[PDB]
Write an enzyme that holds these catalytic residues in place. Structure first.
Site, mmCIF file in Angstrom:
data_model
loop_
_atom_site.group_PDB
_atom_site.id
_atom_site.type_symbol
_atom_site.label_atom_id
_atom_site.label_comp_id
_atom_site.label_asym_id
_atom_site.label_seq_id
_atom_site.Cartn_x
_atom_site.Cartn_y
_atom_site.Cartn_z
ATOM 1 N NE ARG A 58 2.631 -100.464 41.598
ATOM 2 C CZ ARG A 58 2.576 -99.896 42.821
ATOM 3 N NH1 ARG A 58 2.458 -98.542 42.976
ATOM 4 N NH2 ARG A 58 2.718 -100.675 43.904
ATOM 5 C CB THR A 116 22.310 -103.111 52.994
ATOM 6 O OG1 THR A 116 21.362 -102.116 53.573
ATOM 7 C CG2 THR A 116 23.426 -103.445 53.997
ATOM 8 C CG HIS A 176 4.019 -103.878 48.172
ATOM 9 N ND1 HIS A 176 3.759 -103.739 46.840
ATOM 10 C CD2 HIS A 176 3.983 -105.234 48.442
ATOM 11 C CE1 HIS A 176 3.558 -104.920 46.269
ATOM 12 N NE2 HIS A 176 3.662 -105.819 47.229
ATOM 13 C CG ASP A 232 3.771 -103.628 42.355
ATOM 14 O OD1 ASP A 232 3.235 -103.336 41.262
ATOM 15 O OD2 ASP A 232 3.373 -103.288 43.512
HETATM 16 O O1 LIG Z 1 -0.966 -108.037 49.050
HETATM 17 C C1 LIG Z 1 -0.829 -109.143 48.599
HETATM 18 N N1 LIG Z 1 0.255 -109.723 48.113
HETATM 19 C C2 LIG Z 1 1.595 -109.151 48.133
HETATM 20 C C3 LIG Z 1 2.200 -109.172 46.740
HETATM 21 O O2 LIG Z 1 3.571 -108.626 46.871
HETATM 22 C C4 LIG Z 1 2.446 -109.757 49.241
HETATM 23 O O3 LIG Z 1 2.691 -111.123 48.926
HETATM 24 C C5 LIG Z 1 1.665 -109.675 50.516
HETATM 25 C C6 LIG Z 1 0.894 -110.696 51.034
HETATM 26 C C7 LIG Z 1 0.302 -110.525 52.274
HETATM 27 C C8 LIG Z 1 0.595 -109.343 53.004
HETATM 28 N N2 LIG Z 1 -0.100 -109.319 54.313
HETATM 29 O O4 LIG Z 1 -0.964 -110.119 54.519
HETATM 30 O O5 LIG Z 1 0.261 -108.443 55.101
HETATM 31 C C9 LIG Z 1 1.302 -108.325 52.527
HETATM 32 C C10 LIG Z 1 1.858 -108.457 51.281
HETATM 33 C C11 LIG Z 1 -2.103 -110.082 48.445
HETATM 34 CL CL1 LIG Z 1 -3.022 -109.888 49.868
HETATM 35 CL CL2 LIG Z 1 -3.048 -109.315 47.160
HETATM 36 O O1 LIG Z 2 20.182 -94.604 59.228
HETATM 37 C C1 LIG Z 2 20.764 -94.735 58.185
HETATM 38 N N1 LIG Z 2 21.399 -95.790 57.704
HETATM 39 C C2 LIG Z 2 21.424 -97.109 58.321
HETATM 40 C C3 LIG Z 2 22.855 -97.594 58.476
HETATM 41 O O2 LIG Z 2 22.775 -98.955 59.056
HETATM 42 C C4 LIG Z 2 20.464 -98.069 57.630
HETATM 43 O O3 LIG Z 2 20.950 -98.325 56.317
HETATM 44 C C5 LIG Z 2 19.129 -97.397 57.541
HETATM 45 C C6 LIG Z 2 18.668 -96.703 56.440
HETATM 46 C C7 LIG Z 2 17.373 -96.214 56.451
HETATM 47 C C8 LIG Z 2 16.540 -96.533 57.556
HETATM 48 N N2 LIG Z 2 15.185 -95.952 57.410
HETATM 49 O O4 LIG Z 2 15.001 -95.132 56.559
HETATM 50 O O5 LIG Z 2 14.336 -96.353 58.206
HETATM 51 C C9 LIG Z 2 16.955 -97.168 58.647
HETATM 52 C C10 LIG Z 2 18.250 -97.619 58.674
HETATM 53 C C11 LIG Z 2 20.919 -93.479 57.220
HETATM 54 CL CL1 LIG Z 2 19.413 -92.680 57.222
HETATM 55 CL CL2 LIG Z 2 22.028 -92.407 58.089
#
Ligand SMILES: O=C(N[C@H](CO)[C@H](O)c1ccc([N+](=O)[O-])cc1)C(Cl)Cl
Ligand SMILES: O=C(N[C@H](CO)[C@H](O)c1ccc([N+](=O)[O-])cc1)C(Cl)Cl
Ligand SMILES: O=C(N[C@H](CO)[C@H](O)c1ccc([N+](=O)[O-])cc1)C(Cl)Cl
Ligand SMILES: [Co+2]
Ligand SMILES: [Co+2]
Ligand SMILES: [Co+2]
Ligand SMILES: [Co+2]
Ligand SMILES: [Co+2]
Ligand SMILES: [Co+2]
Lengths: 213, 213, 213
Positions: free
Chosen positions: C13, C168, C189, C193
């Site tokens: 990857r 969650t 991402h 995947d």
């Molecule tokens: O990145 C892609 N696909 C992924 C696969 O998980 C997802 O569907 C995706 C599509 C568009 C995207 N965007 O345009 O920001 C981001 C992720 C295609 Cl552009 Cl190759």
């Molecule tokens: O902020 C947290 N948890 C909240 C609770 O609603 C939520 O699950 C969360 C987890 C991660 C996050 N992030 O990493 O950006 C943001 C919100 C933990 Cl980092 Cl304390």
């Protein structure tokens, strides 16, 4: 004024507020299904229509909890004494929508009068905001009556300090013996935790299960 | 060329377009379940396979509505006369995916020929984009055949002016008498409202319920 | 140390990693329902409680797949030998939450001892992080036991290089003959995947369907 400055220094969530406002800014959305079986029966026994009733009920529930009526005004955290719903209206003729608002009233009948009046006056107006600026003390409600969904999320490029909840409803559908309405709630994590959203949804479900008047 | 410059000055959504493009940039996703009970029967009575058929149907529906084929070219809003699907392909050997595209045809049989041909040529190619640059007139389709989901959302750090719809399908499952396929659609709010997405989903459901040829 | 530097140059990857890390930074969330019918029976035949068991099971599944234990350390991609769950705890008295962590153990009984011990020591502590800094080798788990949801998504203003999965869970509910638990998984991402997320969910479902010890 129509708001109170909130006491942030003595608030039990003061750490969480600074954390989710500035250290790790984030919000979340959740979609849950509300059982509208009882509500459908109450509506059948009345002259009220579905959309305005839902608007009223969502506004009523929001108006009960302070954490859903917060805002930053003049760099300080405030709570609105009350908020008015801002809701979407679809124009069949142009296949476009507008957003309107009308004053909330705890009196359902007075609320219906306010609604019909705003609707009467701008039903033909295709501006995005026919009334002009949105009232600062608002909640956003939107409806997608044409399709059922299990999830809905808004991807917003900037939501800094925007604390008003966003509520989106889908077409309801029959699920065995129940009529279920998908409702998506999207909030800012600085003012609302999962508890607060669940509490709002539980309260809305109770209101749907109660007499209208 | 293969596109037309759109008349933004006379468009009924011109205010909404500027609003959601620059004032409050945002997009949304929704997941809904399509009933594929009829489609499954049509497939059973044929030699076509599920994935390519879904690709064809989603492309066909997109190709019917202008708002799903918009883009910015040379700083102007355009509509592609037609778009080709760009879809993900999984390699079991490396447990990685690639994205391929093939020309859309309203003729299902000609579409299958195009698909099999691209598949034949790059089935062993593990580059992310074996064909090189993605055609500008594209739609993205992806499949997660290994798990059922009720929701799916992409959190993209920057989506400025990216108007091509993103469609994601999950593993289908039996829900009482129906075979349901979860389908997530993610669009930019500058070109699509909830109405437009519902219309797309409704049209797709009709196509799934219709003869293949 | 407790991590290994990953071999990015020979990874299948590697293109995808650079693409989703820097060219088109994005993550996704998905919510799926896990069947906890069997697990409920195992719990009924034991003294273990639901939340700690789910924490254990999610941690166990994460601990099996390298792509769920990646991080950037000193500008390089690493894999943690093992990660500890960081989970939310609700305080009924203040209606606020805290996040705690405890060491993972493949021995369920030793894990329960660790959990109860952390719980005993900080049950009254209302700081957001009672233990101080979060261990670098963590996974986040949160529960919304008060409401059922079909979808959940976190909208984070900046998630650059944050690769730990976010899980969650909602209130479970009876769906015909099955007890279903909504579980939302949110990943970056660059390291995961759709295949990797489905694999995690499938493995979790198997663990829920297996003996606890
Ligand atoms: O990145 C892609 N696909 C992924 C696969 O998980 C997802 O569907 C995706 C599509 C568009 C995207 N965007 O345009 O920001 C981001 C992720 C295609 Cl552009 Cl190759
Ligand atoms: O902020 C947290 N948890 C909240 C609770 O609603 C939520 O699950 C969360 C987890 C991660 C996050 N992030 O990493 O950006 C943001 C919100 C933990 Cl980092 Cl304390
Ligand atoms: O833009 C609005 N509504 C749309 C309709 O699809 C959507 O509900 C929405 C609400 C708030 C929002 N925000 O505040 O970022 C974005 C979109 C109202 Cl502000 Cl007019
Ligand atoms: Co600050
Ligand atoms: Co009041
Ligand atoms: Co502009
Ligand atoms: Co055409
Ligand atoms: Co780079
Ligand atoms: Co190990």
């Amino acid at each position: 004024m129509n708001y109170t400055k909130f006491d942030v220094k003595n608030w039990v969530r003061r750490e969480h507020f600074e954390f989710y406002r500035h250290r790790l800014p984030c919000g979340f959305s959740l979609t849950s299904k509300i059982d509208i079986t009882t509500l459908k029966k109450s509506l059948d026994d009345s002259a009220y229509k579905f959309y305005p009733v839902m608007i009223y009920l969502i506004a009523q529930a929001v108006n009960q909890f302070d954490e859903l009526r917060m805002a930053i005004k003049d760099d300080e955290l405030i709570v609105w004494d009350s908020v008015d719903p801002q809701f979407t209206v679809f124009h069949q003729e142009t296949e476009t929508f507008s957003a309107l608002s009308c004053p909330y009233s705890s009196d359902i009948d007075q609320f219906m009068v306010n609604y019909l009046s705003v609707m009467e006056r701008y039903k033909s107006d295709t501006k995005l905001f026919p009334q002009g600026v949105t009232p600062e003390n608002h909640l956003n409600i939107s409806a997608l009556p044409w399709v059922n969904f299990d999830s809905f999320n808004l991807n917003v490029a900037n939501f800094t300090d925007y604390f008003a909840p966003i509520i989106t409803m889908a077409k309801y559908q029959q699920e065995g013996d129940r009529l279920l309405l998908p409702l998506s709630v999207q909030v800012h994590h600085a003012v609302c935790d999962g508890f607060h959203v669940a509490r709002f949804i539980n309260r809305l479900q109770e209101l749907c299960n109660s007499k209208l008047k």
